[PDB]
Write a protein that binds this ligand. Structure first.
Ligand SMILES: Cc1cc2nc3c(=O)[nH]c(=O)nc-3n(C[C@H](O)[C@H](O)[C@H](O)COP(=O)(O)O)c2cc1C
Ligand SMILES: Cc1cc2nc3c(=O)[nH]c(=O)nc-3n(C[C@H](O)[C@H](O)[C@H](O)COP(=O)(O)O)c2cc1C
Ligand SMILES: CN(C)c1ccc(/N=N/c2ccccc2C(=O)O)cc1
Ligand SMILES: CN(C)c1ccc(/N=N/c2ccccc2C(=O)O)cc1
Lengths: 206, 192
């Protein structure tokens, strides 16, 4: 299984979501030395937001008629989508920032949801029926939160617009086998982190 | 009232959410001739994402000791927060991008939720009071609103409610254009 690891925390050595994901990646590497791991940084590195030029190009009615300028507008996106297509397992590490994800990860999503590439649609009696184009891929979301109760059955579950939103977006392009490993209370914390780590080691084994 | 208008669409003239929000602002200006409007562009212009440097400064345990470099990391944030403090009514226009908001608006939120400034902790508590918000959003599809078929997929304006609520803005109205009803709804709102 070829892996694409997308890291979304701006923090490096101190990122818990990054560290936990790397725990999973190393463990996996251990069991599968031939396996390819690609890393895509969207936290410590800026990722362009969708511009009007991007929209005009990505939804151009006749795509092969895009100008060289237009293609250039889509070049990063093409690269980012290519990484996804080349992967069987997508691993996203992300903090919860203000009840969602860091803006860099939102930008990454916005680049890789592409008409005619990762999703499609068809016009049925006026309204669009959409169709995902990604097949045979899985996703693991490793997330870290400062507070508690954002998981299932949690007191604050309805406030969680981070990993549940990621599920929705990923599912839209065809990735609906998604596992979320969460550590809470990074400010019981060493416990939550230790549990996430054991969970990730088990997931890596299999 | 003093109004802060935050525009999140990357599109200019073609932006339906921008257009609708400006219909409201012009109408509101007519019912209140000495109103002041401040516009903050977060769609057509890049907003820096939160960096590790931002985190270290913003959550500094002794903020009065911040170095000049740290204050520089928070300079834009202070400006954005100031615009919010100086406003009575916040108007946010935004598209739904992949079941959330454009990344620029996420970045705006990440700049203006600030420890000791728009929220504090002892239990977190909001520090913004006396403000209202109007969210003008447009979507390509249908059924993302209340009682809607796809309401559970909507992490755009419902998420905005959560984040705004955290800092104290809990009087929020959403006007959505899916698929001239929105326009008329907004004209009526501007009259009150
Ligand atoms: C800008 C910012 C926003 C945050 N928002 C939340 C939040 O909404 N809910 C929460 O539980 N923790 C929040 N936190 C705390 C982080 O979720 C927590 O520190 C997390 O572990 C950061 O991920 P990282 O360790 O990979 O950098 C926030 C932290 C920052 C810097
Ligand atoms: C990158 C991108 C993502 C979009 N995602 C969604 C979506 O998830 N759901 C939806 O109903 N429409 C979606 N749309 C359609 C837009 O929501 C629609 O065109 C909207 O009116 C854009 O706002 P604006 O006119 O102010 O630019 C998307 C459009 C773009 C360009
Ligand atoms: C358990 N409840 C109700 C919570 C707990 C934590 C929370 N946000 N945390 C944060 C929010 C913004 C910035 C930094 C943090 C941070 O470092 O924690 C929101 C709601
Ligand atoms: C009927 N349901 C649930 C829907 C309707 C529309 C929809 N996404 N639209 C989009 C999604 C991503 C990118 C661009 C569009 C766009 O231009 O519309 C998703 C789900």
């Amino acid at each position: 299984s070829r892996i694409l690891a997308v890291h979304a925390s701006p923090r490096g050595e101190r990122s818990q979501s990054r560290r936990l994901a790397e725990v999973f990646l190393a463990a996996y590497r251990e069991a599968h030395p031939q396996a390819r791991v690609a890393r895509r940084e969207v936290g410590r590195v800026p990722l362009p937001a969708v511009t009007e030029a991007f929209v005009a190009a990505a939804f151009h009615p006749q795509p092969e008629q895009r100008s060289l300028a237009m293609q250039a507008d889509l070049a990063l996106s093409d690269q980012l989508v290519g990484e996804l297509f080349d992967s069987d397992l997508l691993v996203i590490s992300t903090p919860m920032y203000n009840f969602s994800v860091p803006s860099g990860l939102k930008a990454w999503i916005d680049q890789i949801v592409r008409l005619g590439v990762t999703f499609d649609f068809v016009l049925d009696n006026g309204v669009a029926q959409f169709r995902p184009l990604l097949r045979g891929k899985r996703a693991l979301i490793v997330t870290s939160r400062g507070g508690h109760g954002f998981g299932p059955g949690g007191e604050n579950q309805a406030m969680n617009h981070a990993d549940p939103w990621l599920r929705t977006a990923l599912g839209f392009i065809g990735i609906d086998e998604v596992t979320v490993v969460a550590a809470e209370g990074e400010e019981s914390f060493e416990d939550s982190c230790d549990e996430a780590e054991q969970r990730l080691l088990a997931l890596a084994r299999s």
